[PDB]
Amino acid sequence: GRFKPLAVKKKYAKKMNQNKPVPYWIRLRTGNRIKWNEKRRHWRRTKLNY
Amino acid sequence: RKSYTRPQFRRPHTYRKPAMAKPSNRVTVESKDIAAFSVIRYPLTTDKAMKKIEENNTLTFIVDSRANKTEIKKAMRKLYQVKAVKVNTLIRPDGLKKAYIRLSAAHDALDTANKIGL
Amino acid sequence: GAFMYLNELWKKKSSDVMRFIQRIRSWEFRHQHTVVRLRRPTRPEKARMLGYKTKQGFCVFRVRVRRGGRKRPVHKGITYGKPKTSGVLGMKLNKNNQAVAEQRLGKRFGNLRVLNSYWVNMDSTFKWYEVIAVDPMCKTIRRDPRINWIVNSVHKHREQRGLTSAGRKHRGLRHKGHKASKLRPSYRAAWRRNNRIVFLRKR
Amino acid sequence: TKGTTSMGQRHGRTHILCRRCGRNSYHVQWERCAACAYPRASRRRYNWSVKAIKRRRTGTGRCRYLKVVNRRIANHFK
Amino acid sequence: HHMKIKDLREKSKDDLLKTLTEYKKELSQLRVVQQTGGAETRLGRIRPIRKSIARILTVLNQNERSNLKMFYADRKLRCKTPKVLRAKLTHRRRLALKENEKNRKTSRQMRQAHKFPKRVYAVK
Amino acid sequence: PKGNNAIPHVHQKKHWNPCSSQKGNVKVFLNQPAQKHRRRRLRLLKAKKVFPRPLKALRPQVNCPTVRHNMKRRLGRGFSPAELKAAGLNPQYAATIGIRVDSRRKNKSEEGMNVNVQRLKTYMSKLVLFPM
Amino acid sequence: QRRLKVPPALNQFTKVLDRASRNEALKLIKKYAPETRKARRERLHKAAE
RNA sequence: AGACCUGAGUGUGGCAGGACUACCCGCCGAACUUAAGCAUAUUACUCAGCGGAGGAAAAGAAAACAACCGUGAUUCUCUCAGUGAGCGGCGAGCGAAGAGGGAACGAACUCGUUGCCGAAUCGGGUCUUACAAGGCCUUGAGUUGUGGCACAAAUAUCAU
Numbered sequence: 082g083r084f085k086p087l088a089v090k091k092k093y094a095k096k097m098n099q100n101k102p103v104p105y106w107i108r109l110r111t112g113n114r115i116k117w118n119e120k121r122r123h124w125r126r127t128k129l130n131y
Numbered sequence: 132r133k134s135y136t137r138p139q140f141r142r143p144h145t146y147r148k149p150a151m152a153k154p155s156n157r158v159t160v161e162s163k164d165i166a167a168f169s170v171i172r173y174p175l176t177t178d179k180a181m182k183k184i185e186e187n188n189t190l191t192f193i194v195d196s197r198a199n200k201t202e203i204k205k206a207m208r209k210l211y212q213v214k215a216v217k218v219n220t221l222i223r224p225d226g227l228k229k230a231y232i233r234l235s236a237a238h239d240a241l242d243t244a245n246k247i248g249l
Numbered sequence: 250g251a252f253m254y255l256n257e258l259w260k261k262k263s264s265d266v267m268r269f270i271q272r273i274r275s276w277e278f279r280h281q282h283t284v285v286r287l288r289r290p291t292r293p294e295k296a297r298m299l300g301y302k303t304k305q306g307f308c309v310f311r312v313r314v315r316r317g318g319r320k321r322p323v324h325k326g327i328t329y330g331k332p333k334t335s336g337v338l339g340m341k342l343n344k345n346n347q348a349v350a351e352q353r354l355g356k357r358f359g360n361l362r363v364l365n366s367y368w369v370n371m372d373s374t375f376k377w378y379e380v381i382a383v384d385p386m387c388k389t390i391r392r393d394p395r396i397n398w399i400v401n402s403v404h405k406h407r408e409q410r411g412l413t414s415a416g417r418k419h420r421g422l423r424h425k426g427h428k429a430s431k432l433r434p435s436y437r438a439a440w441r442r443n444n445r446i447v448f449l450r451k452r
Numbered sequence: 453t454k455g456t457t458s459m460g461q462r463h464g465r466t467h468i469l470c471r472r473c474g475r476n477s478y479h480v481q482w483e484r485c486a487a488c489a490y491p492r493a494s495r496r497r498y499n500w501s502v503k504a505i506k507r508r509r510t511g512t513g514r515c516r517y518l519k520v521v522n523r524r525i526a527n528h529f530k
Numbered sequence: 531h532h533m534k535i536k537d538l539r540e541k542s543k544d545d546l547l548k549t550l551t552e553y554k555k556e557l558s559q560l561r562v563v564q565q566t567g568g569a570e571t572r573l574g575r576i577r578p579i580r581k582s583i584a585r586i587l588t589v590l591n592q593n594e595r596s597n598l599k600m601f602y603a604d605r606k607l608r609c610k611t612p613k614v615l616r617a618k619l620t621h622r623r624r625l626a627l628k629e630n631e632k633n634r635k636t637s638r639q640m641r642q643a644h645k646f647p648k649r650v651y652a653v654k
Numbered sequence: 655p656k657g658n659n660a661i662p663h664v665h666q667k668k669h670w671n672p673c674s675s676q677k678g679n680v681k682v683f684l685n686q687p688a689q690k691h692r693r694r695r696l697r698l699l700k701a702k703k704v705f706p707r708p709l710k711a712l713r714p715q716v717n718c719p720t721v722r723h724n725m726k727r728r729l730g731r732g733f734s735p736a737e738l739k740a741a742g743l744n745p746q747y748a749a750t751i752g753i754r755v756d757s758r759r760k761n762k763s764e765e766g767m768n769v770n771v772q773r774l775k776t777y778m779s780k781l782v783l784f785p786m
Numbered sequence: 787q788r789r790l791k792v793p794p795a796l797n798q799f800t801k802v803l804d805r806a807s808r809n810e811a812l813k814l815i816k817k818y819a820p821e822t823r824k825a826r827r828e829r830l831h832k833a834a835e
Numbered sequence: 836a837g838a839c840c841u842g843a844g845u846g847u848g849g850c851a852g853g854a855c856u857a858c859c860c861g862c863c864g865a866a867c868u869u870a871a872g873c874a875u876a877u878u879a880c881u882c883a884g885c886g887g888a889g890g891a892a893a894a895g896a897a898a899a900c901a902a903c904c905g906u907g908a909u910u911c912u913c914u915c916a917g918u919g920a921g922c923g924g925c926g927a928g929c930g931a932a933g934a935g936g937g938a939a940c941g942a943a944c945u946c947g948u949u950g951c952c953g954a955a956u957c958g959g960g961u962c963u964u965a966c967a968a969g970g971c972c973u974u975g976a977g978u979u980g981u982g983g984c985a986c987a988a989a990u991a992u993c994a995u
């Protein structure tokens with residue numbers, strides 16, 4: 082709630098950044114296979130627990 | 132016959148030569164620069180980071196995470212030749228360590244953001 | 250020569266003189282640790298024949314091994330399945346004490362290449378083998394071709410694999426003829442050899 | 453009872469993050485990683501799960517020094 | 531534009547460390563710009579100016595590794611150099627046997643190489 | 655049903671099949687054509703390396719042992735100290751000029767060494783041994 | 787090894803000479819002592835010089 | 836009031852652990868299954884378990900086979916041989932070896948003993964183009980034996 086180690090804090094911060102959409106300069110690339118991010122977590126759906 | 136006034140035998144205090152102070156475990160060069168440019172990495176421009184330059188005399192730099200409130204002051208003075216009184220820090224929910232920095236009330240903060248180009 | 254006389258004292262190992270020497274020396278051995286570094290070997294005759302020279306880089310250890318048959322480790326002394334395995338105390342460990350002695354010294358002292366070992370003493374409780382070990386990186390060992398071979402890296406834990414003479418004993422080697430038709434080169438090399446299902450291309 | 457009600461009593465943590473295995477199997481009370489046996493020098497590794505060995509072998513990660521040293525020893529140097 | 535290494539090798543340590551602290555400050559304020567405006571002309575100098583600090587720390591390390599090698603790779607007494615400068619090669623290539631042995635033989639093994647050498651005979 | 659079949663005795667009851675659970679214990683020779691090429695490639699490449707020496711050494715005639723084979727002659731390894739002594743050559747020096755030496759054969763019948771003593775001096779005739 | 791019943795073969799070494807002639811026995815052994823790696827290497831050197 | 840012996844302490848110089856494990860080596864080691872039941876047996880000297888190396892490992896130079904007109908390290912292969920061997924509730928099942936044709940193979944060697952030597956050894960230096968298959972200083976190890984040489988009542992050993 083208020084106690085999280087800094088290491089456990091560094092690992093949720095690395096997840097708050099991974100939870101951004103694919104930028105719309107990626108899907109005009111020549112031959113990419115990416116249309117969606119397909120690794121977006123939602124805090125309710127699935128939990129990280131770390 | 133040596134005088135032992137103890138129930139135990141504690142190890143005798145023999146001579147203890149010091150180590151040799153090996154030369155170094157590295158070659159890689161260092162400087163005065165990298166010690167002060169790694170700490171203060173870039174200032175911050177937000178609705179709150181701007182409201183604190185004018186109203187207060189603070190600045191906002193996104194310092195590196197493993198820095199030190201005493202070494203943000205040294206770094207300021209080494210980079211921006213201004214004094215720092217209170218350096219409040221916080222590791223944001225991005226793993227990035229922000230830093231608020233009072234400029235001694237003698238270096239106007241609004242004269243550095245205009246110098247530093249914030 | 251000098252060897253002929255030490256070698257014959259130890260062959261008369263049950264006399265009252267040699268058994269006095271062993272009755273006092275089996276007594277300090279019982280108040281020393283399991284593994285003990287020695288300066289000289291107790292049996293120079295039997296050590297120097299097993300490949301021990303008194304150069305640098307050669308070290309000798311007494312290792313103590315508890316005597317008697319190994320007891321199968323089954324919870325509560327309870328064994329399950331076929332009564333083939335019903336016994337718990339009468340198994341014998343298929344690896345002689347001298348190999349176990351040599352392998353105790355290997356797990357502990359990983360920087361040494363165990364070479365051989367020999368019998369030094371046994372009471373009715375313990376049994377001490379002096380294991381002849383070599384420091385594979387003392388420059389003496391390095392530049393001496395009689396024992397260079399052990400610096401090579403295939404000999405790192407020859408003790409752990411039964412490559413020492415004590416290991417070569419319980420591996421059924423040391424019989425060559427019809428006496429080891431399934432022992433050669435190993436229990437499984439022969440086993441793989443006899444139980445592979447070979448398929449020629451043209452059958 | 454022993455279903456949705458008892459699922460409410462799920463307060464603690466049995467396991468936290470393993471400093472060596474990097475996963476969530478570090479049993480707190482008796483401090484050992486349930487998946488790499490940390491602080492045991494040897495990582496746990498059992499042939500009865502080859503599939504889990506494969507999730508944990510070399511090459512499954514970055515493999516920094518080897519992608520380099522395997523290049524030096526395959527070019528006559530070491 | 532930036533530092534060109536072919537003309538940068540000839541520089542000295544004290545001359546590099548002033549060359550360095552100036553590319554740091556130049557990039558220090560390019561990450562100020564990168565915050566507020568986009569300014570691809572004012573911006574965009576990062577990737578050349580950040581790989582010029584790279585090829586200065588390179589030549590700095592390329593040099594003070596040699597100076598500390600033409601000082602430790604010496605016939606000096608007890609010649610133990612730091613293990614970071616000792617010719618690196620795999621843990622076992624470092625233990626195995628150098629060339630000066632693995633070819634070394636006793637007496638009564640040299641002397642058969644002479645008495646009874648191997649011959650280059652041919653059969654007719 | 656069964657009936658008037660030979661009692662099978664097939665001996666395939668020891669997990670030889672490399673199934674999903676067992677690693678298998680079968681030796682299939684799908685590489686023997688590669689190996690025949692592999693060996694003849696080493697052989698023909700070892701022969702031009704040992705050149706001008708003969709690739710194979712000289713081996714004597716020996717009598718195959720049992721009553722089934724005693725009339726069949728065969729090439730055994732090494733000659734003996736005896737043939738070499740009865741032909742001059744030091745078995746230390748015979749073992750370095752292509753002659754193969756066997757310190758274990760016993761020359762039980764003079765008949766035996768006579769075929770081989772003379773078999774040496776054929777070689778020792780048609781051998782150049784040009785010095786270094 | 788003072789308590790036990792020391793056999794008559796190992797006892798032999800606990801009935802040594804006395805200090806009377808022991809120093810004399812060490813006098814001979816001392817003056818007829820070998821050459822000390824320095825008068826050995828310069829002795830066989832005069833065997834070439 | 837010192838040597839030696841047995842132990843310490845840190846100073847230097849190193850090493851070991853860990854990963855990988857298909858193959859390989861040691862130990863450990865089942866059971867399901869088969870026997871139309873099942874306890875011997877079989878599965879299997881297998882799986883799992885512990886340990887340990889290598890590019891291969893292991894084995895290897897006869898305390899071997901044979902009984903012949905003899906063969907001659909190990910390994911591998913075809914074969915002997917699913918065996919008129921044999922083991923086996925002699926049931927289910929199991930089950931090799933010599934020989935033979937091959938592959939490979941310039942494959943052999945060195946300690947200890949023995950005799951003759953007895954520090955010629957080893958290590959720290961140093962000197963030399965790094966030369967440590969050497970020079971020349973070294974008690975520092977070592978005589979509780981490092982090293983050298985010879986191979987049999989038959990040879991020739993042994994020194995200039």
Ligand SMILES: [Mg+2]
Binds near residue numbers: 151
């Ligand atoms: Mg120093």
Ligand SMILES: [Mg+2]
């Ligand atoms: Mg101790």
Ligand SMILES: [Mg+2]
Binds near residue numbers: 284285286287
């Ligand atoms: Mg000890």
Ligand SMILES: [Mg+2]
Binds near residue numbers: 285286287
């Ligand atoms: Mg001790």
Ligand SMILES: [Mg+2]
Binds near residue numbers: 291
């Ligand atoms: Mg003792």
Ligand SMILES: [Mg+2]
């Ligand atoms: Mg010592």
Ligand SMILES: [Mg+2]
């Ligand atoms: Mg071997």
Ligand SMILES: [Mg+2]
């Ligand atoms: Mg065979």
Ligand SMILES: [Mg+2]
Binds near residue numbers: 480481
């Ligand atoms: Mg706790």
Ligand SMILES: [Mg+2]
Binds near residue numbers: 491492493
């Ligand atoms: Mg621990």
Ligand SMILES: [Mg+2]
Binds near residue numbers: 494
């Ligand atoms: Mg493990």
Ligand SMILES: [Mg+2]
Binds near residue numbers: 841
């Ligand atoms: Mg002692």
Ligand SMILES: [Mg+2]
């Ligand atoms: Mg001492």
Ligand SMILES: [Mg+2]
């Ligand atoms: Mg140390």
Ligand SMILES: [Mg+2]
Binds near residue numbers: 493852
């Ligand atoms: Mg450990």
Ligand SMILES: [Mg+2]
């Ligand atoms: Mg290991």
